[PDB]
Design a protein around this ligand. Structure first.
Ligand SMILES: [Zn+2]
Ligand SMILES: [Zn+2]
Ligand SMILES: [Zn+2]
Ligand SMILES: [Zn+2]
Ligand SMILES: [Zn+2]
Ligand SMILES: [Zn+2]
Lengths: 335, 335, 335, 335, 335, 335
């Protein structure tokens, strides 16, 4: 109920991507009733959204009612498009980042922007990142948990982390491209189980890949409370100790040593989970995030935090806004 | 350190299965050096094990040294063989279940058996389960988290559940058949991450598949503290409420209402995780299990539980033996 | 440097009061560091303290170094809790009073206790004052400068004064509940200016309220040299003379006639102020008090008194100890 | 008995201000009888006054009798009207300031004027000050201890301070708008305690607001001997040093450094208080002021100063007239 | 159901005694789980107690429900520490006695204190008794049935008895330090058999030591209905008459002569035993005692006494309270 | 005054057991006054015995005057010799038992024999018991309260109880091997206190060991009225109910339920003790026994019983002879 690090927004409209690039697989936003729209992917309706998914005016009103001071605006992860031709993804990114920035310019005290990057093309990614930071004023970017067959340990991605560290660009890591078919095509498993699993993999990949070691000043936040990591860290740490031949060939330090090296959002829904999150990740490293405006998010921003008997007000203020400011490298004076 | 619900054993030898059944893909145990052996899985060393993996006397020595009163013996999950022809899997199950039974006969106050079933063939599975319970005297069986393309919600598996409820046969669900390749091939991910994710899916599938509702007297225990479930239950339960169209077509009950309806082992390694586990699953529902004799399990059986200052004696006693006895439906007198 | 009539202490721990009583607004002590703790007011820090605030052995050690023979121990004024439900305030008083008594038992030659009362419920206050004096052996109590809407002239409080007179219970009056917000939120104004003004109001209210006239044997000591009163008494006295319609309908004696009829502590920091204080209040009515262990108090107890070339040695000894013994009705022999 | 820096006067008549401006809350003077009149502020009688409150000839007769050479005339503080519309307050100021000027014009050897300003509107205040100074020939103005929610540290008022320093317009600060109701509704507390408290706040605000530091040639005089300040400066100075985090964020210099940086009137009623006042504020900085014609003031002007055993004649002449001339920037042959 | 002579209490916390004294072997109380604390003696938890063992509010509540008017509070016998350095046992006694005094002063109508002494050092014991009686106001002390190698006949202990007789300090003698190992290591024998036997030895040692002869005004009460003494007194008294050379060297009077010379508690569980006790010790010398809060005690205080159909009301009132008052030299009125 | 169940006798002479066996420690008898003698433990004297301790005529003489019809003759407890090498103990037993039988031959209407057994070697013991019963005609045996470390609950001793129960051989349990040194080396404590405590332990051991439960036809009599047991049974029964984890793991039934399952002698000296004995154990289960010819025994056999006017003739006759006959399995005709 001050800062929302984890919220998604789309332009109200964008050009026909298949016409523009010449191949399909892209997503389009289709208005059909008033206040509602459908996301389509070359046939099937992928998702139904309301006006709050694109109209900043609608958003600030809801934000006012819920006590949210500022949302960090990122695109919807389906937009990542890491699978496409590198310049076409770059072309979509620039469209999406410009749209984000234009929203931010309209309400500089209610919004910051987290840009998207053509991660399948590292040199291109680095330059769009410099542009988001130097030109658009963005404090960071949102990237997926993996880039095609690259997990975040991939040395192909090291130029991206280097630039991010140098530019002081923060990385919000969002799970995407879970298995959607086969056994996972029931009970909403890719969102309920697959995303937390993606995030756990990403965390393990950066730790055991040495990313945090090689880039000690890189600021990273993971979505949904780090997925399963705060609970399974015991297993992950014990395994690493037991088979260094399988786990330690890239980075010899136990994953335990990295607790306190990264942030997670606070989006875990239940009080017992939130308490464990802060016990493992640290009261300084957990950031209120909401998945606004999506149903699987916290419908009442900061309300779980507000209800925690155990948290003193200093702690609650950290989770609500303080940690987000530190993660984004911003000062209170702006909001 | 009273009772270990989670322990694996193998016969010291068994026939060439490739020659026996006519096709490859099976595992053999080879005694390459004294007190050690290799598990071969066509061409490669799947795992290296010591004599405690096959020798009951060695096990009993190690049990005494650690204050373990009884081990529930199950096969090594790689032996499930659900991919094979049903009569062949059944023939192997019989060999493995018979060998387990011999071990229990020789040391009845130190061992109980959990059999293995040809799960890909439900009718054959019911018959072997009948055999394990009636003829072999097993209080339960160990099954995997999925059977080829079937998750545990599969209506095909319903006769297996009905028979287990009937026979008062407990089920120990063990993650197996995770993704071993692609992105999962590095950093021991299939054990560290793939396994708890498999267990989360299995719990979700039994809940949302309506297994616990249809069979309310069926006793089920999940491995590794239920994977990620105690941490992510908030998400899963919230998601269920938000998308009944995806999550509630087979069973209308919210997943949270099955907290207290099933068991998990206590194998989560860290005290914070063990506390959350007991907080979520319940003190009557968490069972000491060790993954003996594998190094990814607990080196010192019950040590974690005993170190928990928050638990009183009677709680610790439940965790160490009482819950296992309740789960298996056995009595203290006899051990 | 003999007796300190103005010193505060807290128990090292006490129950969660919000849970015990059912509503918030209470204070707790949080031990968060090495020899350091914070007073929290519903999770919000309002004072940081050190072990000398709760540890009698640490206090004795500092007293020894400073040459302090005895401290009159009272609770921290924020603990008064006059705003709460009467039986809840009473329950907290009994807890704080019992604690004070146990500290005096440990060091009967180094401490006396000044108890706290549920002043908003005068009949409960009379009963707890009887307990403090008759059973706990306190020479007096500390009370606030006002009780919600009641200033100290309130006839509702007359039974408390009547009991105090009977019991020979001294009253140490401490300013509290000043306006903290609005214009007063800056520059530590509630402490630097608000507190002296509260005490001036209290003195004016006891005088014009006829309290000293109705209860001629009542012994009252005001904190911080009586606030602004010693300086502004000329104005108050002249005003009373000019508008008896506003000032004298409860008590006809001019306030100036009451100089010499009550005590103040000597905590005014400056020699010119100390000299005026003794000129106005009287050499037999000024008592050394330090506000230990708070930094706004006198860092070297008795040092200002000792530095006064205006005072002879007999006068310094009155201010250092003699007057305190007379106020409290104790004999030097027992210290 | 030479110069009275502190005396109030009203026009004998002024228009209905409610009808003039469109809203109530204003004060009116109604001559109910012979040499008597009442101040009304919608419904109640704020104050009863005599002819000496408006009639200059009458005032001069009493001046001659008391040996007062000159009165500095200011409006009654209730007339400040800082709560009204800025343009309306200014209109009233102009009316009151013009009236003051007319009275001085009648007896330029017996009166000087201190104007009133629309302080809630700093631009309009600077303009009317320039006017008072450049056209009406006033040596200074009288303003309140605070301006609605603004204390005298308020950055908003800096343009006013800058103009006063530039115009060499002295400031007389008079307490007003103290709390009138609640606990303060009794025993004339707003005048006897509230006013000295307001003045103490004003002094602290100007000091810790850095006013005297940024406007080193600003001439300021506070009413009633500076409230409580000369007695409590010890507490204020010690607290400043102990909590610079609260007190020093606008001006890091200790309050004690500013003794001698400002004046106060000598209106403290008692010799012990007058001596302390000059000991603290300085013999060159204390100015005879009487609060004529109000009863709470000094009834025999200068009598207290003249009776001062401890003062030599040169010091008395300073308190009686010398210091006023210095404060106002005027010369003894104006009179 | 009026007075309980026999109850034990501990402070909620005490310092690390090993740390304090330089050597181990002391007991500490650990608060690890809720409403429950572990008594730790180097290495081992030897007893688990609940909150009634240290929280007087909890005790008062259970007292009210049981109809118990007053408890005589004594420490747990394990705290006797007669084996340590005299000055260190004295240091511990002072801390334990001050705590008892503090509890008593909080409910002086509901508790009296029986203090503990450093009995292995008779001079130190005398001075602490003096303090317990004169300074703390205890009516008596609790001591063990033997002090290292001294039984209660030891000449070394005579200054203690003389002191107690002088001060009218009653003695409550409690068995402790029984053999715990060997044949006594089964069936709870040290408590069921060893404790009554210790008491029998103590009574024999004090009679045949002449303690009662040489201090005929010394008041002594023994625990658990005097152990086996009421039943075995015939054999003891006959053995005395038979071998005066072994038994009568220190005191020539037959043990029967001291029947009526001392008290016992009524804690013998059975009505036949209770009847014999009163027949042998006397209806004036038997005191209701409960061993609260230990389970070997009387669960429903005074219920055995009230069920005795043979006793008249006067006798029941004596057993329940009158005899206690006589033994303590207290009066009905103060409760 | 009819049958004495409890009398001791020795042969006039026996060999040198040290020479006979190869090691010392033993006891031999040595005359020194034509009817007085000495018992010797390898050099020194622990007992002064008379003619009646070996000479049957002297005994019948004394028996005739005291009105004693028959004495059950047992060896003196020092002779048990349970420590020594079992093959040697079997030997000495046969010597002692043969001597007993000889004495019975001389007066078959005045004496029965109670044999002794090599208790440390239960196989050798069963054999000697069959001999005693089958060839010597004894109705029972006398055994100590413990065998080395074995208490009577020891499983090792179970073949004996089976044998005794089989052969209908009554057991008289006599305390022996008390602690002689340390604290018990004064005031004749081993006999006065140590002996009754040994018996209490033996009874507890037999009840909680399951002895009476497993052998419901075993006839057992304890010496000295059961020690403390009749009086402390309340304590023992209550403790058993409170801590079944300590007391109830060998036999679940409460000790109270065995009242009436065994016998005791009537040697308790005092009428109040005798009455309690018959109240708790039952009039059918108390047996006149004298401890002849020892001073600690009863001088006037049956006098105590005869003095109990609360007993009728029938009761007194049971206590004097009838219970003894039932216990020994003998008919009155024989005598
Ligand atoms: Zn999201
Ligand atoms: Zn396993
Ligand atoms: Zn204070
Ligand atoms: Zn004025
Ligand atoms: Zn006790
Ligand atoms: Zn005997």
């Amino acid at each position: 109920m001050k800062i929302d690090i984890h919220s998604h927004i789309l332009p109200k409209e964008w050009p026909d991507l298949k016409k523009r690039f010449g191949y399909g697989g892209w997503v389009q936003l289709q208005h059909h009733s008033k206040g509602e729209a459908k996301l389509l992917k070359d046939g099937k309706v992928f998702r139904v959204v309301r006006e709050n998914c694109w109209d900043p005016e609608v958003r600030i009103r809801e934000m006012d009612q819920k006590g949210v001071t500022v949302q960090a605006l990122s695109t919807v992860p389906v937009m990542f498009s890491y699978w496409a031709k590198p310049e076409d993804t770059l072309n979509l990114c620039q469209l999406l980042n410009n749209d984000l920035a234009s929203t931010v310019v309209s309400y500089p005290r209610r919004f910051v922007g987290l840009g998207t990057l053509p991660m399948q093309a590292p040199e291109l990614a680095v330059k769009e990142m410099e542009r988001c930071v130097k030109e658009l004023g963005f404090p960071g970017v949102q990237i997926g948990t993996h880039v095609n067959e690259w997990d975040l340990n991939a040395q192909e991605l090291f130029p991206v982390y280097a630039a991010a560290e140098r530019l002081k660009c923060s990385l919000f890591v969002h799970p995407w491209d879970m298995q959607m078919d086969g056994r996972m095509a029931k009970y909403w498993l890719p969102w309920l189980v697959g995303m937390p699993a993606e995030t756990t993999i990403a965390i393990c990949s950066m730790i055991m890949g040495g990313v945090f070691e090689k880039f000690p000043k890189l600021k990273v936040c993971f979505a949904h409370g780090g997925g399963a990591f705060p609970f399974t860290v015991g297993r992950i740490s014990h395994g690493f100790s037991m088979r260094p031949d399988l786990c330690a060939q890239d980075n010899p330090m136990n994953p335990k040593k990295y607790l306190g090296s990264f942030y997670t959002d606070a989006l875990v829904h239940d009080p017992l989970s939130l308490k464990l999150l802060t016990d493992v990740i640290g009261k300084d490293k957990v950031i209120l995030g909401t998945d606004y405006p999506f149903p699987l998010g916290e419908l009442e921003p900061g309300k779980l935090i507000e209800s925690m008997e155990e948290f003193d007000e200093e702690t609650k203020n950290k989770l609500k806004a303080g940690n987000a400011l530190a993660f984004l490298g911003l000062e209170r004076k702006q909001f």
